[PDB]
Amino acid sequence: EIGTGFPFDPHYVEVLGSRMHYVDVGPRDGTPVLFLHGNPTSSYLWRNIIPHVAPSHRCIAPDLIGMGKSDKPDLDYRFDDHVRYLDAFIEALGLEEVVLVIHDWGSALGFHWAKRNPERVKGIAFMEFIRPIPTWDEWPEFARELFQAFRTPDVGRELIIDQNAFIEGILPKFVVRPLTEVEMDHYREPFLKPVWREPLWRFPNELPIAGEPANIWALVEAYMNWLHQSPVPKLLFWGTPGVLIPPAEAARLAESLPNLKTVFIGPGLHYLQEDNPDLIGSEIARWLPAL
C-alpha cells in the first residue's frame, strides 16, 4: 500500500535571500543522497523512496524555489533561475561529494550540476528525465495536443495559470494508478493561488522538443554528451509506456551509457515514484553499497 503521509520534519536554509525547505534524514556522515523533483511536484514525490535509503545514507530532498514549502520570490522562473538557487542550496549545505537521485526538471538540474562538478558526483540514479526529444511524434499521443497548447501563446497560461491544468490534469494523468485526494491535496497546497503558478507554466515552455527552445536544447545536449563519456555509476528506472523515456529510449541508453544498470518498474507513465516506489527505493538502497 502506497503511503500518503509526509513524516519529515521541515528544514530551512537561506539561499540568495530566500528560504528553501528540504527534507534531511539519515546518518549525518557518509556520502549524502540528493533527491531532486520536477514539475509540479516537491519533496513529497520522494516520500516513499527516502525511507529505503535513510537507514544507510543521509537523504536530502529540497523543494525547488517557488515550489513545495520553499519561498516564492519575484523571479522569472526560467531554468537558469532554478540553476542559481540549487547551486546556492548545495553550497549552503556544504555538500562535497553527492549521489544524485533525479526526475524530470530535477534531472535537468542534477545532470547540469554534475557536468559542471563531475568530481563531486559519486553516482546518479534517474528516471523519466529531460532529454532532447526529437519530434512531437515521440511525445505520448494522449498528451500531445495538451502540451502543444501549454506552449501556445495565451492559451497555455489560461490552462496552467488560470485553470491549474498541470496539477488537476497532467499530474493524475501521468500516474497509472489513481492518486488519492490526500495525495492530490499535498500536491495542490503550494499552488492554491494562480499568482503562485508561474513555475508550472515556465517548465513545459522550456521542454526541449523538436529543437526548441534552442537554449535549453543545447544545454541538455551538453549534459547528455557529458553523461555518455562519464564513468560515473548510473541507475535508470523506466516503465511502460513512459512519457519522457519510452521503452525504445531506455533501450538506447542501456546500450550507450557507460556503467549503467537499468531497472524496469512495470506500468509507468511519468511519475514513476507514484506507481512503484518500493521497487525504486529498494533498488537504490541495493545499488548504493557498490559505490
Author numbering: 3 to 293
The authors write:
In all HLDs, the active site is positioned in a hydrophobic pocket buried between the α/β-fold core and the cap domain, and this catalytic center is connected with the bulk solvent via a main tunnel and a slot tunnel.
The overall topology of the secondary structure elements is very similar to that of the wild-type DhaA. Analysis of the enzyme access tunnels and the active site cavity in DhaA115 revealed that the volumes of both the main and the slot access tunnels are greatly reduced, and that the enzyme active site is occluded. While partial closure of the main access tunnel was previously observed in several engineered DhaA variants, the simultaneous closure of both the main and the slot tunnels is a unique feature seen for the first time in DhaA115.
